[PDB]
Design a protein around this motif. Structure first.
Motif, PDB file in Angstrom:
ATOM      1  N   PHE A 299       8.912   0.769  -1.493  1.00 17.13           N
ATOM      2  CA  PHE A 299       7.201  -1.018  -2.019  1.00 17.13           C
ATOM      3  C   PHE A 299       7.479  -1.740  -1.230  1.00 17.13           C
ATOM      4  O   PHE A 299       8.031  -2.765  -1.869  1.00 17.13           O
ATOM      5  CB  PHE A 299       8.314  -0.424  -3.329  1.00 17.13           C
ATOM      6  N   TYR A 300       6.981  -2.291   0.116  1.00 17.99           N
ATOM      7  CA  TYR A 300       7.508  -3.118   0.671  1.00 17.99           C
ATOM      8  C   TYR A 300       6.417  -4.823   0.154  1.00 17.99           C
ATOM      9  O   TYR A 300       7.193  -5.549   0.563  1.00 17.99           O
ATOM     10  CB  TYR A 300       7.150  -2.891   2.117  1.00 17.99           C
ATOM     11  N   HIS A 301       5.466  -4.636  -1.136  1.00 19.69           N
ATOM     12  CA  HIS A 301       5.338  -5.527  -1.043  1.00 19.69           C
ATOM     13  C   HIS A 301       5.996  -6.697  -2.777  1.00 19.69           C
ATOM     14  O   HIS A 301       7.305  -5.849  -2.696  1.00 19.69           O
ATOM     15  CB  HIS A 301       3.997  -5.666  -2.082  1.00 19.69           C
ATOM     16  N   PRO A 302       7.252  -7.302  -2.874  1.00 20.58           N
ATOM     17  CA  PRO A 302       7.206  -8.071  -3.427  1.00 20.58           C
ATOM     18  C   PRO A 302       6.360  -7.956  -4.989  1.00 20.58           C
ATOM     19  O   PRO A 302       5.228  -8.158  -5.565  1.00 20.58           O
ATOM     20  CB  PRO A 302       7.165  -9.920  -3.040  1.00 20.58           C
TER      21      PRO A 302
ATOM     22  N   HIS B  23       0.841  -1.548   0.072  1.00 22.64           N
ATOM     23  CA  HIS B  23      -0.126  -0.154  -0.009  1.00 22.64           C
ATOM     24  C   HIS B  23       0.928   0.929   0.023  1.00 22.64           C
ATOM     25  O   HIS B  23       1.040   1.242   0.945  1.00 22.64           O
ATOM     26  CB  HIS B  23      -1.306   0.257   1.373  1.00 22.64           C
ATOM     27  N   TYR B  24       0.967   2.191  -1.184  1.00 28.81           N
ATOM     28  CA  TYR B  24       1.681   2.756  -1.198  1.00 28.81           C
ATOM     29  C   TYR B  24       1.490   4.405  -2.425  1.00 28.81           C
ATOM     30  O   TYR B  24       0.972   3.331  -3.975  1.00 28.81           O
ATOM     31  CB  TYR B  24       3.223   2.450  -1.306  1.00 28.81           C
TER      32      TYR B  24
ATOM     33  N   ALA C   2      -3.749  -9.873  -8.295  1.00 27.77           N
ATOM     34  CA  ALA C   2      -2.116  -9.131  -8.575  1.00 27.77           C
ATOM     35  C   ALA C   2      -2.584  -7.575  -7.934  1.00 27.77           C
ATOM     36  O   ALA C   2      -4.063  -7.283  -8.607  1.00 27.77           O
ATOM     37  CB  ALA C   2      -2.012  -9.123  -9.908  1.00 27.77           C
ATOM     38  N   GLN C   3      -1.714  -6.987  -7.259  1.00 29.76           N
ATOM     39  CA  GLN C   3      -2.271  -5.199  -7.088  1.00 29.76           C
ATOM     40  C   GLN C   3      -1.690  -4.319  -8.042  1.00 29.76           C
ATOM     41  O   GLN C   3      -0.279  -4.865  -8.024  1.00 29.76           O
ATOM     42  CB  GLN C   3      -2.143  -5.306  -5.313  1.00 29.76           C
ATOM     43  N   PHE C   4      -2.005  -3.320  -8.204  1.00 30.67           N
ATOM     44  CA  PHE C   4      -1.399  -2.539  -9.298  1.00 30.67           C
ATOM     45  C   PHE C   4      -1.085  -0.684  -8.473  1.00 30.67           C
ATOM     46  O   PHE C   4      -2.381  -0.345  -7.874  1.00 30.67           O
ATOM     47  CB  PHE C   4      -1.981  -1.886 -10.352  1.00 30.67           C
ATOM     48  N   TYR C   5      -0.109  -0.811  -8.490  1.00 22.09           N
ATOM     49  CA  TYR C   5       0.638   0.856  -7.559  1.00 22.09           C
ATOM     50  C   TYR C   5       0.791   1.588  -8.757  1.00 22.09           C
ATOM     51  O   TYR C   5       1.909   1.274  -9.253  1.00 22.09           O
ATOM     52  CB  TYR C   5       1.050   0.543  -6.191  1.00 22.09           C
ATOM     53  N   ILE C   6      -0.028   2.675  -8.612  1.00 26.36           N
ATOM     54  CA  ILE C   6       0.855   3.230 -10.382  1.00 26.36           C
ATOM     55  C   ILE C   6       0.872   4.923  -9.738  1.00 26.36           C
ATOM     56  O   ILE C   6      -0.090   5.790  -9.437  1.00 26.36           O
ATOM     57  CB  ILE C   6      -0.743   2.838 -11.509  1.00 26.36           C
TER      58      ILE C   6
HETATM   59 CU    CU Z   1      -0.328  -2.549   0.149  1.00 28.53          CU
END
Ligand code: CU
Ligand code: NAG
Length: 217
Positions: A73-76, A1-2, A157-161
């Motif tokens: 960016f703590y998620h792999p 989460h960022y 899958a999670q997208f941080y954009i």
């Molecule tokens: Cu997160």
């Protein structure tokens, strides 16, 4: 989460959302999870307003740019950066609505010793190169992490954009491609996106990065 609020350019870090379109998770820091959703492109807080609320950074082709998050960016995950020509200018909501997105950089996990090895989960920034042969002009820069810690189910899958607005100067004469659209480039079924990073299939060849091939000149 960022979030990814700070463009890196000229060796310095810009202010939050100075050159990056403020994203809808500015408070929650939660990810985009629907690749068919318009949010997969730039995750804007408000599609019609946010581009006009964003400045445009002038950088030279061949120079190093990047993005800094509001935390590590703590998620792999898998990282990528796409450029699109931006008409009429990078601060327009019309910029990048067509299939003009081309990948310029990626930082994928690597399959070694039978396990996926991910880029650092303690970094809070990524940097890469505007291609030297890139034509001068205005572009949108889309930087993403696809976080894969719960990606074993569809839509997991999670997208941080974050999308930065650029004015590229002193460029070259290359012809960038292949181009894709956002949404469009991802289906959610890609073996690099729909993936169990903990129980890899028996005949797993290696991580397959999603999206088109990189263009570097
Ligand atoms: Cu997160
Ligand atoms: C980076 O430096 C160049 C040359 O000094 C300048 O023209 C440009 O506006 C700068 N871009 C920034 C500060 O975003």
């Amino acid at each position: 989460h960022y979030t990814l609020p700070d463009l890196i350019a000229n060796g310095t870090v810009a202010a939050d959302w100075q050159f990056v379109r403020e994203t809808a998770n500015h408070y929650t820091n939660g990810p985009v999870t629907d690749v068919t959703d318009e949010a997969i492109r730039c995750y804007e807080l408000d599609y019609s307003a946010t581009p006009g609320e964003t400045n445009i950074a002038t950088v030279s082709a061949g120079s190093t740019v990047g993005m800094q998050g509001n935390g590590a960016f703590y998620h792999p995950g898998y990282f990528s950066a796409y450029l699109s020509q931006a008409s009429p200018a990078a601060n327009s909501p019309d910029a990048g609505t067509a299939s003009t997105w081309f990948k310029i950089w990626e930082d994928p996990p690597v399959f070694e010793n039978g396990a996926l090895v991910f880029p650092s989960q303690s970094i809070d920034q990524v940097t890469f190169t505007i291609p030297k042969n890139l034509p001068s002009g205005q572009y949108l820069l889309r930087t993403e992490q696809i976080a894969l810690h719960v990606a074993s189910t569809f839509g997991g899958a999670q997208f941080y954009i974050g999308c930065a607005q650029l004015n590229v100067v002193d460029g070259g004469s290359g012809t960038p491609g292949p181009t894709v659209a956002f949404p469009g480039a991802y289906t959610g079924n890609e073996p690099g996106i729909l993936i169990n990073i903990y129980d890899l299939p028996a005949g797993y060849t290696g991580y397959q990065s999603p999206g088109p091939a990189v263009w570097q000149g």
